[PDB]
Amino acid sequence: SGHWGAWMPSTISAFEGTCVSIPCRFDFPDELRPAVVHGVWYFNSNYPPVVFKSRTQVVHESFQGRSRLLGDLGLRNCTLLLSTLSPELGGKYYFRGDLGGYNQYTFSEHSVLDIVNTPNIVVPPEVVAGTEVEVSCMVPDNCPELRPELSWLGHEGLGEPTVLGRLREDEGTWVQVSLLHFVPTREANGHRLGCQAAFPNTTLQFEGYASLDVKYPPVIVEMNSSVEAIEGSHVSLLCGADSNPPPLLTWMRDGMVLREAVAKSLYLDLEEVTPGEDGVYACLAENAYGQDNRTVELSVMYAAAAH
Numbered sequence: 001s002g003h004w005g006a007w008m009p010s011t012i013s014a015f016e017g018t019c020v021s022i023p024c025r026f027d028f029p030d031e032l033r034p035a036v037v038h039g040v041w042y043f044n045s046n047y048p049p050v051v052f053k054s055r056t057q058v059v060h061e062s063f064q065g066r067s068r069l070l071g072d073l074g075l076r077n078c079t080l081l082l083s084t085l086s087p088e089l090g091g092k093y094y095f096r097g098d099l100g101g102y103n104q105y106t107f108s109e110h111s112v113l114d115i116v117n118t119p120n121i122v123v124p125p126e127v128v129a130g131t132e133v134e135v136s137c138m139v140p141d142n143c144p145e146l147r148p149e150l151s152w153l154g155h156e157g158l159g160e161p162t163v164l165g166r167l168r169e170d171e172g173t174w175v176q177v178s179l180l181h182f183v184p185t186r187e188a189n190g191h192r193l194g195c196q197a198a199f200p201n202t203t204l205q206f207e208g209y210a211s212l213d214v215k216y217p218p219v220i221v222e223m224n225s226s227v228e229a230i231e232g233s234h235v236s237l238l239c240g241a242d243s244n245p246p247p248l249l250t251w252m253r254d255g256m257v258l259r260e261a262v263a264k265s266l267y268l269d270l271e272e273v274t275p276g277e278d279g280v281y282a283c284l285a286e287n288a289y290g291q292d293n294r295t296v297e298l299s300v301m302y303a304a305a306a307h
């Protein structure tokens with residue numbers, strides 16, 4: 001139609017020290033035919049500073065030499081270019097139309113600018129060993145003058161990355177996405193995943209890091225061999241298990257629980273050990289992703305000396 005209104009991405013992101021182009025289109029009643037279209041861009045911070053003002057060419061000091069209007073206002077194109085970004089410039093940007101006389105219109109729709117300094121690494125909330133896992137590095141690509149070069153850090157045993165390239169997201173903005181597809185093992189637990197966004201012809205370089213929390217079933221690593229004890233002596237049986245999260249350890253005999261605790265290792269203490277304590281003892285390691293069990297035989301085969 002021919003009505004008052006604007007169109008711009010509600011949210012948009014860009015790296016610190018780079019630039020950002022905020023795509024903008026506005027509309028007005030055709031009946032006016034002003035032949036001269038003026039406009040004003042405001043920043044979020046009762047008395048908002050002026051980013052751009054076509055009539056008086058006035059610019060707030062925080063935007064001087066950093067703000068430039070791309071596209072013709074006469075073509076209903078209010079696209080804004082912001083250069084040499086700094087955290088201070090993070091906030092809401094809204095546009096105001098000026099068609100002379102009483103025809104000034106501050107449009108409702110605005111754009112939130114998020115200035116970042118680290119790439120976005122996306123890891124699924126639950127990484128389990130033995131399952132194919134996708135990990136992505138996302139980076140804003142809304143700067144026409146400076147294109148980010150995406151790269152991974154510390155991804156040796158995770159396979160070679162697959163670059164998706166420039167992808168469109170909602171509200172008509174752009175991102176750079178790189179992928180990692182791999183089946184992690186228990187060894188991949190605690191793996192440092194790093195992503196780097198570098199800009200050629202500049203000294204700008206941004207790095208982000210994340211640690212892989214890889215879940216895996218218990219594997220009993222510490223277990224006593226065949227125990228041959230002296231009569232009346234003290235016997236300590238130790239059972240250690242490696243799992244993520246830490247397992248529930250349980251010492252059992254004759255289908256009866258002797259000791260039980262949520263830990264990496266668990267001791268079973270036997271005092272004044274008699275031949276009646278002979279038999280097979282079992283340690284059970286169990287968590288949310290599996291279980292493991294080991295048995296040990298206890299033999300009181302050494303007679304106690306007189307003392």
Ligand SMILES: *[C@@H]1O[C@H](CO)[C@@H](O[C@@H]2O[C@H](CO)[C@@H](O[C@@H]3O[C@H](CO[C@H]4O[C@H](CO)[C@@H](O)[C@H](O)[C@@H]4O)[C@@H](O)[C@H](O)[C@@H]3O)[C@H](O)[C@H]2NC(C)=O)[C@H](O)[C@H]1NC(C)=O
Nearest residue numbers: 021022023024025070071072075077078079081144145147
């Ligand atoms: C409102 O005004 C905006 C600004 O005036 C308009 O945005 C511009 O739209 C034009 C299309 O007419 C774009 O020009 C194109 O640019 C691409 C650049 O891609 C290549 O170049 C980069 C670096 O140079 C390179 O890294 C890439 O790999 C590509 O090879 C060219 O490929 C095209 O041939 C064409 O020249 C402007 O780039 C674009 N500017 C911005 C800031 O977005 C907008 O379209 C206007 N809106 C409407 C509705 O007309």
Ligand SMILES: *[C@@H]1O[C@H](CO)[C@@H](O)[C@H](O)[C@H]1NC(C)=O
Nearest residue numbers: 145146199200201202203204
């Ligand atoms: C980046 O390249 C432009 C021209 O492509 C050049 O004018 C500018 O000096 C370069 N930046 C740096 C930091 O050298």
Ligand SMILES: *[C@@H]1O[C@H](CO)[C@@H](O)[C@H](O)[C@H]1NC(C)=O
Nearest residue numbers: 223224225227235236237238
């Ligand atoms: C079982 O192994 C643990 C750790 O190696 C040790 O401390 C403990 O004494 C062993 N048990 C016996 C009965 O030797």
Ligand SMILES: *[C@@H]1O[C@H](CO)[C@@H](O)[C@H](O)[C@H]1NC(C)=O
Nearest residue numbers: 282284285286291292293294
């Ligand atoms: C102990 O682990 C073995 C794996 O070989 C499994 O077959 C068995 O059912 C387990 N026993 C118990 C009581 O969970």
Ligand SMILES: *[C@H]1O[C@H](CO)[C@@H](O)[C@H](O)[C@@H]1O
Nearest residue numbers: 002003004005028029105
């Ligand atoms: C703009 O001005 C008002 C809206 O505030 C209406 O008369 C009409 O929508 C026009 O486009």
